């Protein structure tokens, strides 16, 4: 029995998607509701939008955009061509917002239902869709990310901790460079890391949720996963004790590294996916590694939270849309009987109201 449920939702090539457009710079998946692909049909650029609730009926539209990102919840698309940004409500056939940057945007992403983050060579901006807001600079980029391909930007729930992630080659490996910025302290911290997420976690004995920062890295010391509280604990809270655990890479995966992370706050579990298709699960509280295995023979380049199961959904270069979530009926006996960790099993059972620890 497996502590996870692993599903294939879609094979994009069955919708006529050219596998040449299945990659990081042409396919976006900002949430589990839509996938968006830029393709050139003949001389014409277009965008194909796949509604994950109705995948046999993709919308195709001509565009002149070098990047397209759908809103996480609504058919509202952000498109850019160089310095020109335009936000369109597709169903209303209207341009909601336009802005012209004074720098190219090398990465952008919806960080919430209504804010787009924009990364230039020099800085990171947030652009709210409310009212007449223009982009606001959040911080300047740290020099440790200079030259990196930017691959992710995330925030905590309150948008007080901001995390920029780049990668580059140093000594013939892929090295991750992160910039963690505190909005309240206005201080950046450079961190070596490949994939990360924030999460809200309420410790036993605390009245308030802690904000945790979880990041995985393959460094010189090998693979490591860290879980720490960021910021000053809310008044009355105990601090969350820092965790650090190994991230295993097998000897035949010598150039693999972590590419994606999502955290289930329903199960307090960390899903970590590596570039070459390995899935790891860790307990958010303790960092204990629950499971590893390989789920994709092709590289995975984009993930989102899989809302329904509180898992992780993603796309590989073949165009499979795959998800992993916790198998709620199996996870506790797995931990008890295969990992032989009754302490963790029992803890997770009562912590997240899962069945199976009636017998340990």
């Amino acid at each position: 029995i497996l502590p996870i449920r692993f599903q294939e939702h879609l094979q994009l090539q069955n919708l006529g998607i050219n596998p040449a457009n299945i990659g990081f710079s042409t396919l976006t998946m900002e949430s589990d509701k839509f996938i968006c692909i830029r393709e050139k049909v003949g001389e014409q650029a277009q965008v194909v939008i796949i509604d994950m609730n109705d995948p046999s009926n993709p919308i195709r539209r001509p565009i002149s955009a070098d990047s397209a990102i759908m809103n996480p919840a609504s058919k509202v698309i952000a498109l850019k061509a160089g310095k020109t940004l335009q936000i369109f409500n597709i169903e209303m056939k209207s341009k909601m917002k336009a802005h012209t940057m004074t720098d190219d945007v090398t990465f952008w992403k919806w960080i919430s239902l209504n804010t787009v983050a924009l990364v230039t060579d020099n800085a990171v901006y947030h652009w709210s869709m409310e009212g007449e807001s223009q982009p606001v600079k959040m911080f300047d980029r740290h020099s440790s990310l200079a030259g990196c391909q930017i691959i992710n930007y995330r925030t905590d729930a309150k948008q007080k901790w901001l995390l920029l992630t780049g990668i580059s080659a140093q000594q013939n490996r892929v090295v991750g460079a992160m910039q963690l910025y505190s909005v309240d302290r206005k201080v950046s911290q450079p961190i070596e890391g490949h994939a990360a997420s924030f999460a809200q976690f309420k410790m036993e004995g605390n009245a308030e949720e802690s904000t945790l920062f979880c990041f995985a890295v393959r460094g010189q010391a090998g693979g490591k996963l860290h879980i720490i509280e960021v910021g000053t604990p809310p008044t009355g809270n105990q601090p969350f004790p820092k965790k650090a655990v190994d991230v295993f890479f097998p000897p035949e995966a010598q150039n693999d590294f972590p590419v994606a992370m999502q955290i289930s706050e329903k199960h307090d579990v960390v899903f970590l996916i590596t570039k070459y298709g390995y899935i790891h699960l860790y307990d958010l509280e303790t960092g204990t590694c629950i499971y590893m295995n390989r789920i994709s023979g092709e590289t995975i380049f984009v993930t989102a939270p899989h809302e329904a199961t509180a898992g992780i959904i993603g796309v590989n270069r073949k165009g499979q849309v795959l998800s992993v979530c916790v198998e709620e009926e199996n996870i506790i006996p797995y931990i008890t009987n295969v990992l032989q960790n009754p302490d963790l099993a029992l803890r997770m059972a009562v912590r997240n109201n899962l069945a199976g620890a009636e017998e340990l």
Binding site: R5, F6, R294, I295
Partner: peptide, 6 residues
């Protein structure tokens, strides 16, 4: 080895 999906 590898998991295969439902």
């Amino acid at each position: 080895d590898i998991l295969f999906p439902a």
